[PDB]
RNA sequence: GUUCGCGAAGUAACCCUUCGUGGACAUUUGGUCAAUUUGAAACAAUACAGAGAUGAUCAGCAGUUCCCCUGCAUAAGGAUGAACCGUUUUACAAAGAGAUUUA
């Protein structure tokens, strides 16, 4: 396959030009978004893939498990700072859901950061969330 | 250049001519733009094919698109105008069983 950096250029522009033909006709159909900003982190560039979720989520944000990717999309490349800032974006945007708090704590905990923990559970309460938020606090 | 006025000289007899001087009349055009190759019409010819739903031969309407063309057109046509017809793994768990390691 590859060679050179040239090579390697028009295997992306040719990538490129298909899926956001795909995209260009469906804005809906999720799966290609993720997929797509998949391939873009296999090439090494984040900055185009930080976009690449962040229009998905201009067209749906209700959508979980785009939010969740794109954390892992942060933190598997060991960036956590981005994964932080999302995590406030994501909680704030969505506070009903759980996943987002749990994933949040846990993303406090792997890093023993306590100060968080509390002062986060003391939102996650604050807002009078029901049974499993006080049990697990 | 005109006209009014003054002064001078000449003609003169309050004028005709010349000179000097004062005043009045008349007042800011045009460029988004330089003169064919290097700041962009689009075709044609040549070659290759030779029309969507089917097992086959065809009528068509649409639908989406950061594609348009002809048309006065919010009419209607342009192959049903064309493109589409592909690639695809994670909100993730529960229970049971054997094996490995250990407080
Ligand atoms: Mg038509
Ligand atoms: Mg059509």
Redesign the pocket.
């Known amino acids: 396959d590859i060679l050179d950096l040239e090579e390697l250029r028009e295997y992306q522009r040719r990538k490129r030009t298909?899926?956001?033909?795909?995209?260009?006709?469906?804005?809906l159909?999720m799966?290609?978004w993720?997929?797509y900003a998949?391939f873009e982190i296999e090439q090494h560039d984040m900055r185009r893939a930080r976009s690449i979720f962040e229009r998905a989520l201009l067209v749906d944000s209700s959508f979980?498990?785009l939010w969740?990717?794109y954390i892992?999309a942060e933190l598997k490349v060991k960036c956590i700072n981005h994964a932080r800032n999302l995590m406030n974006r994501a909680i704030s945007t969505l506070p009903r859901?759980?996943?987002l708090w749990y994933?949040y704590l846990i993303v406090e905990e792997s890093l023993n950061n306590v100060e968080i923990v509390r002062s986060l559970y003391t939102k996650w309460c604050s807002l009078e969330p029901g049974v499993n938020a006080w049990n697990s606090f």
């Open positions: 298909e899926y956001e033909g795909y995209l260009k006709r469906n804005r159909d799966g290609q993720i997929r998949q979980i498990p969740i990717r892992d859901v759980d996943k994933k």
